[PDB]
Design a protein around this nucleic acid. Sequence first.
RNA 1: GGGCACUCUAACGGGACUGCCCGCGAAAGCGGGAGGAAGGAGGGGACGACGUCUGGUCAGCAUGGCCCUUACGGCCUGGGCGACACACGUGCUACAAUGCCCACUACAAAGCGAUGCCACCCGGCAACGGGGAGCUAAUCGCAAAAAGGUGGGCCCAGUUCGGAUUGGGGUCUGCAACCCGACCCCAUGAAGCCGGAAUCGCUAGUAAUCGCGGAUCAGCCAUGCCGCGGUGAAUACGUUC
Lengths: 127, 206, 23, 83, 60, 116, 155, 97
Amino acid sequence: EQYYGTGRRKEAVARVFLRPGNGKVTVNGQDFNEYFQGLVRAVAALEPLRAVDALGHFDAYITVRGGGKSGQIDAIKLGIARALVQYNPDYRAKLKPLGFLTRDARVVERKKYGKHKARRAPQYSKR
Amino acid sequence: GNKIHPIGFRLGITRDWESRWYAGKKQYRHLLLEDQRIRGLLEKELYSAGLARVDIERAADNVAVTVHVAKPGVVIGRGGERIRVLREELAKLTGKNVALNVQEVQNPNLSAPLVAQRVAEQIERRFAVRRAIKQAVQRVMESGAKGAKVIVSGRIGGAEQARTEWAAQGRVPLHTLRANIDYGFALARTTYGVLGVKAYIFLGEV
Amino acid sequence: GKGDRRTRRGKIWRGTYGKYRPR
Amino acid sequence: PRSLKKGVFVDDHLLEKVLELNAKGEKRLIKTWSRRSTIVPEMVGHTIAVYNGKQHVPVYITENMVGHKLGEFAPTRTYRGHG
Amino acid sequence: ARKALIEKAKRTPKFKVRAYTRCVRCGRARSVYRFFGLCRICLRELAHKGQLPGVRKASW
Amino acid sequence: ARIAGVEIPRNKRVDVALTYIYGIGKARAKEALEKTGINPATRVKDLTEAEVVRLREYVENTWKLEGELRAEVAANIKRLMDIGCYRGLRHRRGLPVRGQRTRTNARTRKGPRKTV
Amino acid sequence: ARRRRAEVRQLQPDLVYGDVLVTAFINKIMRDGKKNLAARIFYDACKIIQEKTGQEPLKVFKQAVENVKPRMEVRSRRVGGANYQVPMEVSPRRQQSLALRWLVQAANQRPERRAAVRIAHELMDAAEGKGGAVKKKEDVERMAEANRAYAHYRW
Amino acid sequence: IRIKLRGFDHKTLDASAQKIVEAARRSGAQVSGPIPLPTRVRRFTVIRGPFKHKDSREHFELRTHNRLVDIINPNRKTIEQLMTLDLPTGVEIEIKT
RNA sequence: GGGCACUCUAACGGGACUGCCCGCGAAAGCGGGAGGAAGGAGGGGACGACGUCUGGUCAGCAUGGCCCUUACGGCCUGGGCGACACACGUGCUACAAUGCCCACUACAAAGCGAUGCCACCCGGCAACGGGGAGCUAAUCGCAAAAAGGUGGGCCCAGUUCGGAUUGGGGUCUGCAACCCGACCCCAUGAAGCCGGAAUCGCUAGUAAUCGCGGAUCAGCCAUGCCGCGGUGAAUACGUUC
Ligand SMILES: [Mg+2]
Ligand SMILES: [Mg+2]
Ligand SMILES: [Mg+2]
Ligand SMILES: [Mg+2]
Ligand SMILES: [Mg+2]
Ligand SMILES: [Mg+2]
Ligand SMILES: [Mg+2]
Ligand SMILES: [Mg+2]
Ligand SMILES: [Mg+2]
Ligand SMILES: [Mg+2]
Ligand SMILES: [Mg+2]
Ligand SMILES: [Mg+2]
Ligand SMILES: [Mg+2]
Ligand SMILES: [Mg+2]
Ligand SMILES: [Mg+2]
Ligand SMILES: [Mg+2]
Ligand SMILES: [Mg+2]
Ligand SMILES: [Mg+2]
Ligand SMILES: [Mg+2]
Ligand SMILES: [Mg+2]
Ligand SMILES: [Mg+2]
């Protein structure tokens, strides 16, 4: 009577709960596309359920918190396919190959000392 | 001009701190000085005893001091006299519930600073620089040790040309945290310059 | 912009608020 | 610049001198270190030999310069230029 | 010119602006710290010596 | 000079177009337009002869402008250059006035570097 | 580099036409990492191109690139006391890299005022065979053939 | 019924935060498990070199880990025995209600 | 009301071992698969070999000796370290439309905070001022993040580009803003249309770009420094140089 999954992306974290709905999306209150007013990478996070056809077969209650949107939407995507397994332990295939059932630690590099940034360095006059 | 300090490099990993206590944003700069101050007077009076390390614990208006010396007799005096005359001039400056223990040193030669201190004497005794430096290591390795090193840098042999000469023996790896390398630099004041005196001691890996 | 003052971003630039950055 | 809630600040000591001559009998050649001290409307006429690190520059004040400070008529720099 | 400074500092200022921070231990003018009452130099010294409570190197 | 003391361009918005008038800036734009109730979106070209004067008139008797505006700040300086205060010398030479830098920069009151 | 053959970054196909190629172009569009911006001017240009050309502009820019794909460029080889513009069979990855770098380059050249305007207008011409976008390629491939005397120096 | 624990050595800090859970539990009657108050990291950054060499530093952090504890079903048999506690050194504690 | 599911937090642990398959192998290993969030050092960190540059630092401290002894010491007011025909280095902003402005609408982190952080109220176009609740701080505050988005304007101009310059008008701190503080408002809007010879950085969450914290600190001339996250590429044939 409920399907919940968690997805993170950078400083962003998400708690995705899938529910047998028409296809509505409650993400922290307002509608999916409302909370994503003009972000192309939007319909991406919804790609998993699309990998197994389940786009319209469900509604989902969604929170999101941490960092910015780009981290959020990705984190969203993460927890959903995360869920499809708990609603089809055989659904690993059709996501794992797609890689959506996979989190990435492609995270920040600490600003290192003597460097302006984590890699950028101050130019110099050699001679 | 590089090597990282081994004690700060083994604090809480291989070797725990000395002054133990937590203070707020308001007394902790003051506590430091009151503790540093203490190590000042002691380092002068216990010097003859063979001081090695003064643990300090605090709490509430009181403060616990631990003293690890291989020769406790000196610091104590008759029936505690010398040790008992130290619990008055003590709180004289610090001023607060002050205790002061005196731990027993199993073997001092296994104490890097307490080792380097001796040599620092000898050199000021006009002895042979290259000699004792090797002398100490054998004494350490005979002291059941499995790793020791002693370094001397400066106007050796009175020479105008400065110079670094040092010895070692057994295993002394300096990138192994799982390896108690006791540390301690004693200094030598001399009519003809000063001599930095460094000494490391691998006691084992856990 | 970032250097100009009589502007939000220019003031945002220099962490002040005034007639064009109202608290 | 200096607050207005905080009135025109004069050294007060530089200040007694001037009013000591404003009625008792001006004027004499004072040699002030006061530069902070604003020029004031009991000081015009006087010859406040203001100081500037090395000497006292005489600067007879007038009804065309007061709102400024005594640090604004005894230059600290001497620059006849380069070359 | 030094010990006159280290002294003068400690004495109470004529004005509060003239009260000015030092390193009680070493006495370094700059890079000093109120939290400790030290200089940057000593800071790194008693640090490695561990005689600085709770404070250790950083790494992440 | 349809506008008091100068001919402002046209095909552009009144509010802005006033800035092409010495002493007339944005902060003073809305004011008259507000005082003259003249919508700042309408173009000066598109203005009304009555508006013109209202936007002309009011603008003409509440501040200084152009000529008499340059007329003030000069003496304000010349006096300085007479009393010879620090801001006087900084103008008596052509140097920075607001504690600016002199070893370099300040290449705006020095103009292009002059050879040596 | 010196070790082995570097890897080819496979991109995440776009979210509109389902293509990685599209995903590649927006990047060149994308300044200061402003994907939303870049993603706009593209699918925006994709609109103007549609209005003035009623064929699925997906194909349009599927075409206008091949027309931009140069087959032979020159590369300088300085054997002995001279450097030779030794031409070489351009590489695929690079050809896309080459075509993907002048359209925008020639689009940013273009005089019309709005972004999606220019970017689109370069899309069409190449689909026909016009514009500086085809110019570079054109000029490039023949200097090489204008230097066909150095192919033995190839690599 | 609040009891707060504070110290730098988390290990010691924790070891304390156990006895006061072990103890009050026995005498009772209800106690709220320990909650690790996140750390107020007071880091300090100083250049290694004692003169210029801006480009070679060395960090040194400070970790003020904190532990809060309570006693739902209190009891003074707890309270009385509490004042009899051999809590370690590196730790400050506060109690509120 | 309650509730530890979850998010989160911070202590203890599991975890990747080339340990399994095919494969070329003498072995050591290399290619590739599957499984796994993650694979062949996981991403980075701190960790700097005997040693070189008679490298830097008597100006943090220590110390060899030489030199000063109503002075080469010490306190104080003023004044320089902010000068200025020039000649380099490291940045800030830019020269525009993938842009500038106005308003409106969401999304971080790591930090800092008791004559500190400043809620909410009110004065003022404002900096700020004055009241005043709350927080020994996972409560409470700084505090809003910005890039972004949704709308409207700017129609290719040295402009609604740039904010240098200067006048005028004050705040705030401080005993005291004259050389010498910054924050606020007005008017003025200078050079600059992508920059010669020469040269710098970076290989993945990197460069790019947005902004935010903290230490130093009465205020701070900070575009710095150390940190913090947001959004987010291109390219590497190859080793001749
Ligand atoms: Mg975290
Ligand atoms: Mg960054
Ligand atoms: Mg002699
Ligand atoms: Mg502007
Ligand atoms: Mg009088
Ligand atoms: Mg004007
Ligand atoms: Mg490999
Ligand atoms: Mg000294
Ligand atoms: Mg010395
Ligand atoms: Mg000497
Ligand atoms: Mg003096
Ligand atoms: Mg001075
Ligand atoms: Mg200087
Ligand atoms: Mg030049
Ligand atoms: Mg430069
Ligand atoms: Mg202008
Ligand atoms: Mg001009
Ligand atoms: Mg010009
Ligand atoms: Mg690299
Ligand atoms: Mg601060
Ligand atoms: Mg900053």
